[PDB]
Design a protein around this ligand. Structure first.
Ligand SMILES: Cc1cc2nc3c(=O)[nH]c(=O)nc-3n(C[C@H](O)[C@H](O)[C@H](O)COP(=O)(O)O)c2cc1C
Ligand SMILES: Cc1cc2nc3c(=O)[nH]c(=O)nc-3n(C[C@H](O)[C@H](O)[C@H](O)CO)c2cc1C
Ligand code: SF4
Ligand code: SF4
Ligand code: SF4
Ligand code: SF4
Ligand code: SF4
Ligand code: SF4
Ligand code: SF4
Ligand code: SF4
Ligand code: SF4
Ligand code: SF4
Ligand code: FES
Ligand code: NA
Ligand code: NA
Ligand code: NA
Lengths: 318, 443, 191, 333, 207, 196
């Protein structure tokens, strides 16, 4: 009298192998060499801050997922990515509580108040960075980036470029490798490591070439049309990190192919407009945040054509 | 010969585990001792039994009479004695009225069966009458009647017949064996269908992983200039009657208008072989091919088995269970239906039996959407499955209808590529059912 | 060149909704759909475009050479009220009657705080006819752009799992705060 | 002092007069909308956007009148009195209705009707119906995933620990949102005064139904012979009760061998509980009404009648010219 | 022909609508003019008093003040090479028993963050700064409104001989150095430019 | 019986800030301190009381087509008188709220209550409704201003709490720092409304 007790469900009965955790682990693997370069250049305090941010993020999420009576999905490695990308946006002379406050703002308000993973419309790390810059401008402006051991530099390359003093800026090879006197955010000084990390993600299939190519092409064309150097404007500031890792966020980007091209062109235009005639030395963060607002408007005009539809010339709605 | 190539846009690449049963020879099932024949082996109107308990039947004798126009008769597979005219379990999950026949041992042919004729004198009306009388339905899976398909309405014009040889679901190899063994019957059935409809053009579409079948079909065609063979790139939704039309002819079927409005007639190679066999011999449809495979089968193989044999006899003939199964599926892995018991008989549209073990039948719980966008990229109809699923999950049928949810073909792949392991196709099916139901209670 | 800079400053740098805190109640009221937002925007554009010239003429032709500058506000609001009545007099007749779903925000166009606000701003800045017209049109275009973007974001958020307690107004206020931060990035430019 | 008061008064008066005349002229032109009989039915409606409708809101119903495009009693949620108040603006109507509540015709709770297999997917009734109709042993029973609770707008359905829903009669307002949302066609509407309901929906024969569930209907037909008012009929291999002919005699309840009919044995037994004030030594009920139950001699008041039998139908409560018999339920428990 | 000859009384109901509004408007004016009168006088008086208070703190002494006829102010603005005119509002001269004590000058410099700031500066006989104050500002309450606090008190003691420049650092270096507020820089530069133009006016006048 | 209910609708049941969401521009504009909110609430309460009494006293002669001009004329007259008195006697509060004192005439609450309760009631119900609405507006403004000021300045009513080394959150006194705060407060109230 042996039974079977089979399982009944709906089609299909097979699935693929990739999941969310694999994608986030691959993102962390791509981000590792920039962390190695940062630890080599800025010392042992550049790593500890990162750890602090990561811990805070995870803790916050768990507490919320315990209080709202929801499953604790902390093993998808998303808060780790948010914490690492937030920690890469900090100077070397920041106190310990700034990272905690930024992580709490990024996780509790931007992400978990809208539903959770994938339910928001804006970038958490960039919004937390913009909140920190506005709340405490003393700890985040032009002096926190220079290490205390150096007393000759006193200025970052973009500030010298805006002031017109292009005689004391570091050389282009030094700006490209980030190894001789180049200072700034701890995870933006090297463009070779970020390029390698972006190429690895393109090869795996997580991201596409469209946004990273068109962002840099628009920047180069804008720099060439006003009589500037295209190479310098691309290897200085937070452009490679933004182009490869922060403008390709899943929950804030369009899903089609034409919308991505328009999104990249708009980002590249606004970045240079704020850089050249604005009140900031850099405008990458606000250019990306302003294109997260117009994304639902682009997505309603760039839809594809269904199979078998020859379209009616605006007569159904009449 | 002039072999052209074709392909379409979108799709997936499953592992395609067909190599297990491709090199195994073709097997033949033994003589059955008991058959259960249901009254609904097609779609439309169920038949009415015309036999009683204790009666004696022959081989090929009719045991069911059609009711309306969209209906086909039902015959008997073996010669014996009728023991029950009650209702028995069916593959749809509910009991269906059936006839149980106990075999005698001798195959006595009904003394009213003779060959119909030859190709040179049958003509279209008698060809259609022979097709109706033999109870031939669609062997591609839908089990639509063939005599209805060959009756073109006067307000429609067609000019070509396309045979579907692009067998695309994994684990299935019956069509490969049929094409490699009986190519002449396939060509004869294509010619008969072409004469019946009244056209002078015919195409055959075979995928590029069956080059031996392509060579056999080319050799069987000979010097005929009205027949062509196409090679299609190996993809999953390639053979679904619409991507085949797009790849071979280049036309597109309109939004809800059937292939007959595109001027084509699509038919399967197994149906053509059955038409040719029934014309040559005069016997009705009582036997077909099957592929018994899976992870819990000792000796997977492709075997020819009569209609009415239970699943358990087929499983026992192929070795048995090496381990305890966790899932039994009638069909393929992408469009099959899970079963409850093993007393189910085989039918005219059954193409395989797939048994999976407990470890291979486990899928993780669904999670939150991460807006990756792969489901948009894999859709062959160019829809957006995520929006339809999210609208259907909170009972918004107007938004589902406005997002073109009624032209989905329920093909799998959108649910196959999801990293979050969701159930998009089930939600789309729920939305389609609700939209269809609301058109009857409000009109 | 001055007119273009005035228009650009009115639209982007000094948006009336996200910076100056003027058009907030209709911003949260009728921003649940794109079509209603567009209709409200074009109506408000017509109202300010008609009101700016009349207020300029009334202030500079009668009030100034009479030492009667303390009546300004009441006189101004009187004109605006009549104009809004005429708008409410037309929309029900010729415009579709299905657009009367604003729900009390149609007679509150006088109260919109952006018509009288832009009139007072134009008076205080000592502009001319063309400058006042351009400032009014720029303010109206900024209001229209802000409300259209808000409506699009809300339509996107319609498929999100806002748990049970925030729902409409709290999530609208949080979205407005995030948009205000993004536009706080759009500041400091000298034009 | 004279001019300082004279000038602003004149200016403001001229402005006000000109604006008023212009506004009156514009109103005489653009107000040709000509919609008469201001709604006056929204106040008599009380509406909460429940769903027993399909005109785009109660305000749309208020706008739809004076055009004759809507029915007088189109709203069933409010009731007959609500419709009487709504169309009493013009009047010439009067009516009344009966209150009803939702009920579940099933009593198989996860141990008398177990599961055939295991189901993987979302926890919803329609999603379960996609997967070959479900995994329950009985193909007509309750799945238990609470779609009806999800579609209820007034919060009246709670899913019990046994798997079957329960409806609060104080929060259910006579609609059908849970009736067409059930994939099994199980939820029904029953009058609140009815206590005899056949709770099953099984359309199978004897042996299969007996194997499927503990309290299934085997279509034996023993409940039809007990009833004499022709209120319960067996069709499609299932029994059903007509509520318009049921006298609540509680005779079919004890005759069912499988316990499918709801109700307890506490009924009737009040044979000729006659008030002594308003009968004239009638002598008409003593003869016959299907049982004897009365037999005696003349029965001058007060009546001397022993009560040990009869079924208590209720026919002897209204057929009297004076209605001297009073019906009172008084039994054990 | 007026939309098919509206029937007579359609004009009469016009006369009902306007007149009432007319009456209402008159009543409003009949209030406001009276409320205009007395308050206005008081307001003016208060303003004048406040203004003189703003002067009496900028030059701590017991003396009298005299105002130029403002034509000399325009003459000073025309000369010296002032690029932007009308940025000098009032110049006053202090007098104590005949001897010249100093000057008090009010200026509105442009190029602020949110418009025009009003800065009043007093100076003694020998070139020194005895203190500055802010009269009118429209800056951010938490960011640019800190100029009217402890930041002003550091301005005293500077000689009125050379210009003043602003340094973005905690170290005040040496002479004619002004340390700006952290996170607020344009507001400091506007006040510095106003003080510089006041020093230029004093240097031109006192020679 | 009919007066206390109208008076006590007011703060709790029909709060203009928390339940109706009206008059949002001065709510989000001037609430950077606990002093500006109280003064704005008191001025709005006086204007509301005067306008409601005046409008309810004349609900017999105003036609339907010219109601808005008469309403705005009366409200603007009262606003002008109050502003003149405040300019004469309280200059600091005038300078703190310079632009929004002429804008009390258009406040989304006075006109809304004028055409919904004052037009079809007596002189006694309108007075109680105006008093309740003014008290609710004042309480909401004071609470929001105190909450914003404590975080963004480190002091309540001008009295320091955290010392002289405290570094304030300067976003709370910025335009983006109001919206979020208000939203959270409303959410909290809704939760306590729905779970009780
Ligand atoms: C996703 C999908 C895949 C299909 N694959 C095949 C296939 O591989 N072979 C086939 O013959 N029919 C296939 N069909 C069925 C065809 O659409 C079509 O119904 C069939 O060619 C009709 O054959 P008949 O005329 O013999 O009934 C598929 C249908 C769908 C929806
Ligand atoms: C390709 C990729 C890019 C991401 N970029 C970001 C980012 O820029 N900022 C961030 O906070 N999280 C980022 N995340 C992770 C984050 O948890 C998720 O994408 C959503 O933005 C969370 O709502 C990224 C994840 C992926 C896979
Ligand atoms: S939405 Fe339909 S057609 Fe598109 S991939 Fe999914 S099942 Fe296939
Ligand atoms: S594939 Fe899945 S997770 Fe990705 S967008 Fe589609 S539904 Fe969302
Ligand atoms: S059922 Fe009646 S009361 Fe309910 S929404 Fe519809 S019309 Fe209004
Ligand atoms: S009554 Fe119907 S809808 Fe409700 S739980 Fe049972 S099967 Fe589901
Ligand atoms: S239980 Fe059913 S009938 Fe009763 S209120 Fe809820 S949905 Fe309506
Ligand atoms: S047999 Fe009747 S009572 Fe039992 S589960 Fe089925 S429907 Fe319910
Ligand atoms: S209760 Fe009485 S009247 Fe009703 S069905 Fe049963 S026997 Fe018949
Ligand atoms: S007596 Fe009970 S089991 Fe028999 S038919 Fe009636 S309800 Fe069904
Ligand atoms: S039935 Fe009525 S009238 Fe007849 S004896 Fe009884 S009480 Fe009297
Ligand atoms: S209940 Fe019926 S049977 Fe009994 S006494 Fe009354 S009428 Fe007769
Ligand atoms: S728009 Fe409502 S008070 Fe300003
Ligand atoms: Na703002
Ligand atoms: Na802003
Ligand atoms: Na005023």
């Amino acid at each position: 009298m042996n039974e079977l007790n089979l399982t009944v469900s709906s089609s299909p009965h097979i699935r693929a192998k990739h999941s969310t955790a694999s994608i986030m682990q691959n993102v962390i693997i791509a981000l590792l060499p920039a962390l190695a370069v940062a630890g080599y250049v800025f010392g042992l305090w550049a790593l500890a801050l990162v750890a602090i941010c990561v811990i805070s993020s995870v803790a916050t999420e768990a507490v919320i997922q315990k209080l709202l009576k929801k499953p604790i999905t902390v093993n998808d490695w998303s808060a780790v990515v948010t914490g690492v990308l937030l920690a890469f946006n900090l100077p070397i002379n920041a106190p310990w509580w700034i990272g905690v406050v930024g992580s709490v703002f990024a996780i509790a308000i931007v992400k978990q108040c809208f539903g959770g993973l994938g339910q928001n419309f804006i970038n958490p790390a960039l919004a937390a960075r913009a909140f920190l810059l506005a709340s405490w401008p003393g700890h985040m402006t032009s002096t926190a980036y220079i290490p205390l051991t150096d007393t000759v530099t006193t200025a970052t390359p973009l500030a010298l470029l805006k002031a017109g003093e292009t005689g004391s800026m570091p050389s282009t090879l030094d700006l490209f490798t980030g190894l001789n006197g180049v200072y700034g955010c701890i995870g933006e000084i090297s463009a070779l490591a970020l390029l390698i990390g972006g190429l690895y993600l393109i090869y795996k299939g997580i991201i596409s070439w469209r946004i990273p190519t068109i962002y840099l092409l628009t920047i180069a064309i804008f720099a060439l049309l006003v009589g500037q150097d295209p190479i310098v404007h691309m290897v200085s500031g937070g452009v490679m990190l933004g182009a490869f890792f922060m403008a390709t966020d899943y929950a804030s980007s369009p899903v089609t192919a034409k919308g991505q091209i328009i999104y990249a062109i708009g980002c590249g235009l606004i970045t240079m407009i704020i850089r050249l005639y604005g009140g900031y030395p850099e405008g990458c963060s606000y250019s990306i945040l302003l294109m997260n607002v117009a994304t639902p408007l682009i997505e309603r005009f760039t839809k594809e054509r269904i199979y078998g539809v020859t379209k009616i010339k605006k007569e159904a709605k009449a | 010969m002039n072999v052209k190539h074709g392909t379409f846009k979108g799709g997936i690449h499953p592992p395609y585990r067909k190599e297990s049963t491709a090199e195994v020879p073709l097997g033949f099932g033994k003589k059955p001792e008991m058959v259960i024949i249901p009254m609904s082996l097609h779609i439309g109107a169920p038949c009415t039994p015309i036999v009683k308990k204790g009666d004696t039947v022959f081989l090929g004798q009719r045991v069911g009479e059609p009711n309306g126009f969209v209906s086909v008769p039902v015959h008997a597979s073996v010669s014996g004695k009728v023991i029950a005219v009650e209702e028995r379990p069916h593959a749809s999950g509910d009991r269906v009225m059936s006839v149980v026949i106990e075999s005698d041992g001798l195959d006595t042919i009904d003394p009213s069966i003779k060959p119909y004729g030859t190709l040179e004198d049958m003509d279209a009306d008698a060809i259609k009458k022979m097709v109706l009388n033999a109870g031939i339905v669609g062997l591609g899976g839908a089990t639509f009647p063939t005599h209805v398909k060959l009756a073109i309405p006067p307000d429609k014009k067609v000019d070509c017949v396309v045979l579907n040889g692009a067998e695309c679901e994994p684990y299935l190899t019956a069509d490969h064996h049929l094409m490699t063994s009986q190519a002449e019957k396939v060509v004869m059935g294509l010619k008969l269908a072409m004469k019946s409809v009244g056209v002078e053009k015919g195409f055959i579409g075979v995928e590029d992983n069956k080059t031996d079948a392509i060579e056999a079909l080319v050799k069987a065609i000979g010097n005929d200039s009205r027949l062509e063979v196409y090679s299609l790139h190996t993809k999953y939704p390639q053979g679904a009657e619409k991507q085949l039309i797009a790849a071979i002819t280049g036309r597109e079927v309109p939004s809800g208008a059937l292939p007959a409005d595109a001027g084509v007639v699509v038919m399967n190679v197994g149906t053509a072989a059955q038409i040719a066999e029934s014309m040559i011999t005069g016997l009705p449809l009582y036997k077909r091919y099957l592929t018994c495979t899976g992870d819990a089968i000792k000796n997977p193989q492709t075997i020819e088995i009569r209609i009415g044999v239970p699943f358990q006899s087929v499983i026992d003939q192929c070795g048995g269970f090496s381990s305890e199964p966790g899932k039994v599926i009638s069909g393929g892995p992408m469009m099959g239906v899970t079963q409850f018991v093993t007393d189910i008989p085989v039918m005219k549209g059954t193409s395989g039996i797939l048994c999976l073990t407990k470890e291979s039948a486990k899928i993780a719980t669904p999670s939150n959407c991460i807006h990756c966008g792969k489901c948009v990229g894999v859709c062959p109809i160019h829809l957006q499955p995520l929006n339809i699923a999210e609208y259907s999950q909170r009972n918004m049928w107007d938004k589902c209808e406005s997002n073109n949810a009624m032209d989905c073909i329920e093909c799998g792949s959108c649910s196959y590529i999801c990293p979050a392991k969701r159930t998009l196709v089930s939600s789309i099916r729920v939305a389609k059912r609700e939209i269809i139901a609301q058109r009857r209670k409000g009109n | 060149m001055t007119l273009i800079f005035i228009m650009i400053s009115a639209i982007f740098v000094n948006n009336f909704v996200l910076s100056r805190f003027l058009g907030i109640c209709p911003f949260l009221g009728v921003s649940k759909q794109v079509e209603t937002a567009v209709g409200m925007g074009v109506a408000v554009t017509f109202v300010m475009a008609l009101a700016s010239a009349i207020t300029y003429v009334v202030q500079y032709a009668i009030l100034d050479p009479l030492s009667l500058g303390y009546l300004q506000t009441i006189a101004f609001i009187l004109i605006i009220a009549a104009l809004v009545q005429l708008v409410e007099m037309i929309i029900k007749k010729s415009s579709p009657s299905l657009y009367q779903a604003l729900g009390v925000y149609l007679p509150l166009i006088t109260t919109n705080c952006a018509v009288l606000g832009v009139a007072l701003i134009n008076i205080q800045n000592e502009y001319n006819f063309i400058e006042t017209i351009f400032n009014g049109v720029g303010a109206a275009l900024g209001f229209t752009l802000a409300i259209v973007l808000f409506a699009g974001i809300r339509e996107r958020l319609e498929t999100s799992a806002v748990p049970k307690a925030l729902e409409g107004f709290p999530i609208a206020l949080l979205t407005a705060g995030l948009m205000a931060i993004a536009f706080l990035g759009f500041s400091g430019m000298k034009l | 002092m004279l001019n300082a008061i004279l000038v602003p008064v004149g200016i403001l008066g001229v402005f006000g007069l000109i604006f008023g005349i212009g506004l009156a002229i514009a109103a005489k032109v653009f107000e040709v909308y000509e919609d008469p009989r201001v709604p006056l039915v929204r106040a008599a409606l009380p509406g909460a956007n429940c769903g027993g409708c399909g005109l785009p809101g109660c305000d749309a119903l208020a706008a739809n009148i004076v055009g004759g495009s809507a029915a007088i009693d189109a709203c069933p949620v409010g009731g007959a009195s609500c419709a009487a108040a709504v169309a009493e603006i013009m009047g010439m109507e009067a009516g009344s209705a009966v209150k009803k509540v939702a009920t579940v015709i099933c009593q198989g709770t996860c141990e008398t009707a177990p599961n055939r297999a295991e189901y993987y997917g979302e926890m919803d009734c329609r999603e379960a119906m996609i997967a070959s109709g479900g995994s329950k042993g009985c193909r007509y029973g309750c799945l238990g995933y609470g779609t009806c609770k999800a579609v209820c707008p007034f919060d009246a359905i709670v899913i019990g620990e046994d798997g079957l829903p329960k409806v609060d009669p104080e929060k259910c307002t006579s609609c059908g949102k849970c009736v067409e949302a059930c994939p099994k066609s199980i939820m029904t509407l029953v009058p609140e005064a009815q206590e005899v309901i056949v709770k099953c929906h099984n359309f199978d024969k004897g042996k299969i139904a007996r194997l499927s569930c503990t309290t299934a209907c085997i279509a034996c037909g023993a409940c039809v012979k007990a009833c004499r008012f022709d209120a319960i009929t067996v069709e499609n291999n299932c029994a059903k009760i007509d509520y318009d002919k049921c006298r609540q005699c509680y005779e079919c309840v004890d005759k069912c061998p499988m316990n499918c009919i709801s109700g307890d044995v506490e009924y009737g037994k009040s044979t000729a509980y006659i008030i002594e004030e308003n009968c004239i030594a009638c002598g008409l009920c003593a003869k016959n009404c299907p049982v004897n139950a009365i037999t005696g001699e003349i029965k001058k008041p007060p009546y001397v009648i022993d009560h040990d039998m009869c079924i208590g139908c209720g026919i002897c409560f209204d057929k009297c010219r004076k209605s001297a018999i009073e019906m009172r339920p008084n039994k054990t428990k | 022909m007026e939309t098919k000859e509206k029937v007579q009384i359609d004009w009469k109901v016009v006369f009902k609508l306007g007149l009432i509004l007319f009456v209402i408007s008159a009543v409003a004016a009949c209030a406001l003019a009276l409320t205009n009168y007395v308050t206005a006088g008081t307001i003016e008086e208060m303003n004048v008093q406040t203004n003189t208070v703003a002067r009496q703190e900028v030059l701590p002494k017991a003396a009298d003040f005299e105002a130029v006829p403002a034509k000399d102010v325009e003459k000073i603005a025309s000369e010296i090479g002032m690029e932007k005119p009308e940025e000098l509002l009032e110049v006053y001269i202090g007098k104590s028993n005949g001897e010249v004590v100093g000057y008090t000058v009010k200026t509105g410099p442009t190029s602020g963050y949110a418009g025009e700031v009003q800065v009043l500066t007093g100076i003694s006989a020998d070139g020194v700064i005895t203190g500055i104050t802010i009269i009118k500002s429209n800056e951010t309450p938490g960011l640019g409104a800190k100029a009217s606090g402890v930041w002003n008190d550091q301005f005293t003691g500077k000689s009125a001989k050379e210009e003043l420049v602003v340094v973005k650092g905690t170290t005040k270096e040496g002479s004619n150095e002004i340390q700006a507020i952290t996170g607020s820089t344009i507001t400091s530069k506007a006040v510095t430019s106003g003080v510089n133009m006041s020093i230029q006016v004093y240097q031109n006048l006192s020679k | 019986m009919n007066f206390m209910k109208n008076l006590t609708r007011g703060i709790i049941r029909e709060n203009p800030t928390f339940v109706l969401v009206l008059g949002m521009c001065p709510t989000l504009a001037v609430t950077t301190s606990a002093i500006n909110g109280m003064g704005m609430g008191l001025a709005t309460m006086l204007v509301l009381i005067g306008s409601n009494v005046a409008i309810s006293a004349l609900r017999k002669v105003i036609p339907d087509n010219i109601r808005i001009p008469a309403f705005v004329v009366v409200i603007a007259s009262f606003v002008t008188i109050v502003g003149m008195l405040m300019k004469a006697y309280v200059p600091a509060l005038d300078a703190a709220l310079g632009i929004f004192i002429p804008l009390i005439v258009v406040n989304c609450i006075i006109l809304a209550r004028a055409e919904a309760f004052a037009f079809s009631n007596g002189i006694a119900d309108s007075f109680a409704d105006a008093v309740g609405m003014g008290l609710g507006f004042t309480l909401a403004l004071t609470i929001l201003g105190s909450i914003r000021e404590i975080l963004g300045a480190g002091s309540i009513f001008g009295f320091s709490l955290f010392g002289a080394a405290y570094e304030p959150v300067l976003l709370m006194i910025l335009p983006p720092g109001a919206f979020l705060t208000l939203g959270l407060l409303i959410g909290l109230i809704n939760w306590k409304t729905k779970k009780a």
